């Protein structure tokens, strides 16, 4: 399953960010919510103007977020991962997500 890096993300730290992104020539809308007690980011994925999000999950490092969901016509077939740029023991935080902040959220697409 050859895959190539094709997109990177950044977060400003606002607890209720929402924006639209284009992946594999298809367009999706994303929502990020910050959880206080669990100090983690909650990601919701869905179609543009959809009544409810298609997928909701909790973000973690080195875990394949989309693994159990590559069976729907509206879910990207690529790979979405979070891995750190600094010390390997650093876990995902609020302000430490970005191309140079410490954590590299990235999307990669299979070659077809």
């Amino acid at each position: 399953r050859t895959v190539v890096r094709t997109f990177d993300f950044e977060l400003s730290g606002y607890p209720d960010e929402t924006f639209r992104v284009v992946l594999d020539s298809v367009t999706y809308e994303l929502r990020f919510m910050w959880n206080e007690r669990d100090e983690s980011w909650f990601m919701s994925l869905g179609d543009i103007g959809a009544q409810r999000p298609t997928i909701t999950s909790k973000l973690t490092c080195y875990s394949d977020i989309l693994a159990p969901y590559r069976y729907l016509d509206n879910v990207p077939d690529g790979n979405l991962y979070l891995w750190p740029l600094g010390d390997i023991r650093t876990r995902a935080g609020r302000f430490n997500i970005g191309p140079l902040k410490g954590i590299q959220m990235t999307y990669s697409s299979l070659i077809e």
Binding site: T27, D47, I48, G49, A50, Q51
Partner: protein
């Protein structure tokens, strides 16, 4: 303590080349040198209209006192279609507001001040040259015809509402520009087709999508809403019934995160309810002028797709 001041950015990239896959204006931003020609602190006047129809969305721009190098780079490529993106916001962020190709460019430099002009088209090249040649027999499912024609158009699919188990009643043939053929299928099946900021949108008339936007005095509204007819003419009526026929108007501070096919909620003191969007116009004067957006709303009477 600061004030609330405007900001913007304008980017110019490589010539756009259509190939054998969907076109994304994003990947053409970088120039051969790498970083693109960015213009930030120069007085700019622009007008960008958007709609849901066959025609592409077009926007106009004017820039004063450009450096000679940038003008030289546009004197060249006058045979080619440079990719351009525009951003605007308030001193803390800038939302994409237009993306397309430079259809026209001219320079007039009488004495004191040069004034560059632009005319930009949202996917004009694809919508006006994508030829097709297709046919189908009696019994073919209509849902297959729709997907076949859109793939020909070579644009990303923003959103589509399939027909279900509909089937063709008579043999069909399609030629010429793909956009024209699709716009004809719209009339006979109650569907709206319109490309916008590179995204293909296929929806059904009368019906609408949640409250993706709320308008109120806190949301930077400008003046009270007023009722305005959505068309410059009236049609004869039996008095499909589901079609449009009513609307309203609202104005708001510039906000590029809105599209013609979206849905808005109107929280005012007189008018309250949900509406579709039908038309957008973005205006802007950096040093002097408005920085607002105008929305033309249309009442809905269909199902909540």
């Amino acid at each position: 303590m600061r004030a609330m001041e405007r900001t913007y950015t304008l980017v110019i990239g490589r010539p756009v080349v259509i190939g054998e896959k969907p076109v994304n204006i994003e990947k053409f931003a970088n120039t051969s040198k790498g970083d693109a020609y960015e213009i930030k602190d120069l007085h700019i006047e622009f007008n960008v209209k958007k709609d849901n129809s066959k025609e592409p969305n077009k926007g106009y721009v004017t820039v004063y006192n450009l450096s000679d190098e940038v003008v030289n780079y546009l004197s060249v490529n006058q045979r080619e279609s440079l990719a351009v993106m525009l951003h605007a916001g308030y001193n803390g962020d800038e939302k994409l507001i237009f993306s397309g190709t430079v259809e026209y460019v001219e320079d007039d430099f009488p004495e004191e001040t040069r004034t560059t002009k632009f005319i930009l088209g949202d996917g004009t090249l694809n919508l006006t040259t994508a030829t097709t040649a297709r046919s189908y027999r009696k019994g073919t499912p209509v849902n297959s015809v729709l997907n076949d024609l859109i793939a020909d158009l070579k644009l990303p699919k923003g959103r589509v509402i399939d027909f279900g188990n509909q089937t063709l009643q008579t043999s069909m043939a399609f030629t010429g520009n793909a956009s024209q053929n699709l716009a004809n299928l719209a009339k006979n099946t109650g569907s709206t087709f319109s490309v916008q900021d590179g995204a293909v949108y296929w929806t059904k008339e009368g019906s609408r999508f949640n409250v993706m936007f709320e308008i109120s005095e806190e949301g930077g509204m400008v003046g009270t809403p007023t009722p305005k007819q959505p068309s410059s003419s009236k049609k004869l009526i039996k008095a499909h019934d589901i079609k449009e026929d009513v609307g309203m108007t609202v104005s708001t501070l510039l906000n590029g995160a809105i599209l013609p096919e979206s849905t808005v909620y109107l929280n005012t003191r007189y008018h309250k309810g949900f509406y579709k969007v039908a038309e957008l116009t973005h205006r802007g004067g950096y040093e002097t002028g408005d920085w607002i957006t105008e929305l033309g709303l249309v009442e809905t009477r269909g199902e909540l797709i």
